[PDB]
Design a binder for this molecule. Structure first.
Ligand SMILES: Nc1ncnc2c1ncn2[C@@H]1O[C@H](CO)[C@@H](O)[C@H]1O
Ligand SMILES: Nc1ncnc2c1ncn2[C@@H]1O[C@H](CO)[C@@H](O)[C@H]1O
Ligand SMILES: N[C@@H](CCCC[NH3+])C(=O)O
Ligand SMILES: N[C@@H](CCCC[NH3+])C(=O)O
Ligand SMILES: [Cl-]
Ligand code: NA
Ligand code: NA
Lengths: 517, 517
């Protein structure tokens, strides 16, 4: 049920439409040409020795044309004052009974321009303003309006400027009301767009080529996640939405492209929380002839570059929403490097290699809240990965690279070049307690790759709930063609944006996050 | 059934893995440090003074490191010559019995470096090369190799050069093989990446902000297309993949963002042909206070800019694949502009407003192959659009903007400012007989918007093949909040890429196009 259709404001505003048309005025006209942005006007004349209001009345000061939403209005008799919001910038306007005209309002109309402005316009209407600049004596840049043009008649009132909890929840769907009302929300989303641009700048300077690969595939992989499934009618075929970019980009390495990246939507059909939306944006990037130590430098340099460009060359950022209180994190490279084992000793208090497997499980029972089913029959590598999750991850506030993970954690990474085949040359980057990056010395031994994908699914099929996952033969054939040694990474871009915009929730960095009905 | 695992060449290549490893050489090593690109090497010394082969043997010429795939090889006794392919650039290599060492091959090994190169390496292997540059007597850039490093032992041969129908059809799946064997394929996809980068540069310069909006939504709209459907588990909810970008971006204009664009995947669950893939890339862009004439200029200027950047300032492009023979088209702005009615006269030979509806029907009956069901009861506006489809569209070879479409073709556009409410301020741009762009003076009268969507719903209720499609109430509520007058366009980027890379099919501009099983 659409409630506003019976609201008093909607009925009152719509009844003005016929009145305005009867005056010969189109309430939804076609353009407003030669229209400067309020912010460009500010930048052009704020540092400038403009006249006072009487100079504007004398038409001696600069004449400007601009447009925006009427967000404040006060009638003062012969004069009226208002505020126009244009694309995150505001400017004061002044209407005068003698000076101001309404476009399309005939001289022999039954209503004066100033009365039209008071009675037929409303807060929320979009207006085109042409007039003369001046400074109030308080220094407020103001426009004496010579001609006002109605550009859009709004039919509901402005949103409440200061949302309580319930209004905020609705504005995650009705995002336009958030963008109208909140300077902070507007700035968050402008910064997000700048971050995406800075990423492309950095990768391009490093000679990576940006590509696109399919979201809809007959397979899925390159991560551990439940997929979305859909039906292609033309071929009467089930398709998956990709859970990662990895396999497709690796095929491009085989194809001879030495440095590729993609910034794209990936889809994981799982739970929704402060750091998880089912549709999210990743960059994956791959450079032939690199290993994971090369990738580590690329990832920290990328993030430092973004932060410096946003914060006047500074590398420190304030984040306010951790349960432990406000933090300052420094993204200056190099970030801290630790092995997973080292991080469990330093932050967890457990030297993993001094304990047998049986002793590790007792620590998990006593020092964590993991259910017995999680660790009762897990392997040594799986137990180490669990100790990290529970005793370490939350403590990684400053930027950390965590290196050398158990082989169990992934089938797509080479093992340690030293010969230790129980650990892989993987790292995950953490900041503010949350995972930010995943990177490998990429596996390109086709026989070893097949064996790990075979051993993975035999283990994955041990759980009766994991959807069966057939081996991606096309990928193995591409590796037989020959993939160069390579180093690759994947960064959750929404999470990066949260850290850099002081966003408490991923819902704050997506225009339209997934919401309950 | 994987055929190559039973092929002789797979046995031959895999059998060398043990032999190479028994010599202490890792066939899949971890990196190749400080590796220059062959293109960068060519840029630096091709147009430069360089020594001859004897200078290289004296180690007086520039020393370089690079890597790539061995794609030609010929032994001449003590010398051997080959070609290395690195990301669409090639360089010749020379090996010599006394000068060239193999990384990790011991002196007391049982095989000589030259014999290892001849016998343990194969075409298709990925090699790291360190050596000295020189020019052959014929002037070809060559590297006398001081050390070769095996970076990847390929287990299958280079792709066959003899393409057929069966061969090239598999290449659309096994794209890595296509990329290795075909310079034209590599250049097509390199050009595609440049086009995307050029679009972003142009749009950014016009002050459009790049945004992302969601692919997965609870509604679909903004085009006439069958959607893909999927299921979001966490909410037990049916979702649609978007069929266009339009509604989400319009909501951002309501929110106060003056100029936005998105380059994103959209999904239309329909048929496959030379200009349709179910997943394709669109740019949509919206500018407040513009109309369709402003957009027309923006579109043709955007495309002219792209063409000039790719073609050293020229605006003419050759396209080879039309049934009418090769064409030259000129993307120079301004493009030809005609109304739909004018184009039916100029190209179709019909002057529509001299004819009654029943004469239009009789023209469709006798001059086209449309089934009678399509026109026997169609409205005048629908008859005009069918006359354009059948008698005009294929003849629009040079770039055209076709303006002022019947109202029936879309519910999202303003009618003509002249007061002719049977036509809308829409244009579609055509080149080489195909639609390139769709653009509007955007409809922002909420009452008129609801009326047109209701009329569409009433019409679709009569077609038993289409399921009920509820009106988007959130979109209508945003329009009530108030959208500025605006102009928007959507361009099919894959079709633009086809036109600028002389691609016969959309399958030639997607790395992994949708393929029958
Ligand atoms: N559902 C999700 N929402 C947001 N970011 C995610 C999600 N799942 C994973 N990520 C991010 O993607 C990266 C690569 O897996 C992770 O390190 C994490 O930052
Ligand atoms: N299935 C498709 N594949 C590729 N491009 C398409 C497809 N459908 C429409 N387009 C492009 O999208 C634009 C907007 O509808 C069209 O002008 C056309 O260029
Ligand atoms: N596909 C990985 C990112 C790249 C990992 C390194 N190859 C992920 O989703 O986590
Ligand atoms: N949504 C349109 C493109 C924009 C049309 C102008 N608002 C389409 O898919 O064709
Ligand atoms: Cl509250
Ligand atoms: Na016929
Ligand atoms: Na129907």
């Amino acid at each position: 049920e659409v409630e506003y259709l019976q609201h008093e404001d909607y009925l009152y505003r719509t009844s003005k439409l016929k009145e305005i048309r009867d005056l010969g005025i189109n309430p939804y006209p076609y353009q407003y040409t030669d229209c400067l942005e309020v912010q460009e006007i500010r930048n052009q004349f704020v540092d400038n020795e403009l006249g006072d209001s009487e100079a504007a009345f004398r038409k001696e000061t600069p004449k400007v044309r601009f447009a925006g939403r009427l967000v404040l209005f006060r009638s003062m008799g012969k004069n009226a004052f208002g505020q126009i919001l244009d694309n995150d910038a505001k400017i004061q306007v002044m209407f005068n009974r003698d000076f101001s005209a309404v476009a399309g309002l005939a001289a022999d109309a039954g209503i004066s321009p100033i009365k039209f402005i008071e009675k037929k316009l409303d807060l929320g209407d979009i207006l085109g303003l042409e007039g003369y600049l001046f400074f109030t004596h308080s220094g407020e840049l103001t426009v004496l309006v010579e001609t006002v043009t109605l550009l859009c008649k709004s039919l509901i009132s402005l949103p409440d400027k200061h949302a309580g909890l319930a209004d905020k929840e609705i504005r995650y769907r009705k995002r336009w009301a958030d963008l109208i009302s909140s300077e902070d929300v507007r700035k968050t989303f402008l910064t997000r767009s700048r971050i995406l641009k800075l990423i492309r700048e950095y990768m391009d300077q490093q000679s990576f080529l940006e590509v696109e690969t399919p979201i809809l595939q007959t397979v899925y992989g390159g991560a551990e996640a439940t997929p979305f499934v859909t039906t292609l009618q033309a071929l009467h075929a089930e398709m998956f939405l990709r859970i990662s970019l990895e396999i497709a980009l690796k095929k491009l390495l085989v194809g001879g492209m030495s440095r590729v990246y993609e910034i794209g939507k990936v889809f994981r059909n799982e739970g929704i929380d402060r750091t998880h939306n089912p549709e999210f944006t990743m960059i994956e990037a791959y450079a032939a002839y690199w290993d994971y130590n090369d990738v580590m430098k690329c990832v920290e340099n990328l993030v430092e570059y973004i932060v410096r460009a946003l914060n006047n060359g500074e590398t420190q950022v304030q984040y306010s929403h951790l349960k432990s209180g406000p933090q300052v994190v420094d993204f200056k490279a190099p970030w801290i490097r630790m092995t997973m084992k080292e991080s469990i000793s330093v932050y967890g208090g457990v030297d993993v290699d001094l304990h047998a497997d049986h002793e590790l499980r007792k620590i998990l029972e006593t020092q964590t809240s993991l259910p017995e089913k999680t660790y009762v029959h897990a392997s040594r590598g799986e137990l180490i990965a669990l100790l990290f999750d529970e005793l370490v991850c939350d403590k990684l506030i400053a930027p950390h690279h965590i290196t050398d993970h158990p082989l169990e954690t992934t089938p797509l990474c080479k093992t340690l070049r030293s010969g230790d085949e129980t650990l892989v040359e993987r790292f995950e980057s953490f900041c503010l307690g949350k995972e930010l990056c995943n990177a490998y010395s990429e596996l390109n031994d086709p026989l070893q790759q097949r064996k790990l994908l075979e051993e993975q699914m035999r283990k994955k099929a041990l759980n009766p709930d994991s959807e069966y996952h057939p081996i991606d033969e096309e990928f193995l054939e591409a590796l037989c063609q020959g993939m160069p040694p390579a180093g690759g990474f994947g960064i959750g871009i929404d999470r990066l944006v949260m850290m850099l915009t002081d966003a408490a929730s991923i819902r704050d960095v997506l225009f339209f996050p997934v919401m309950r009905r």
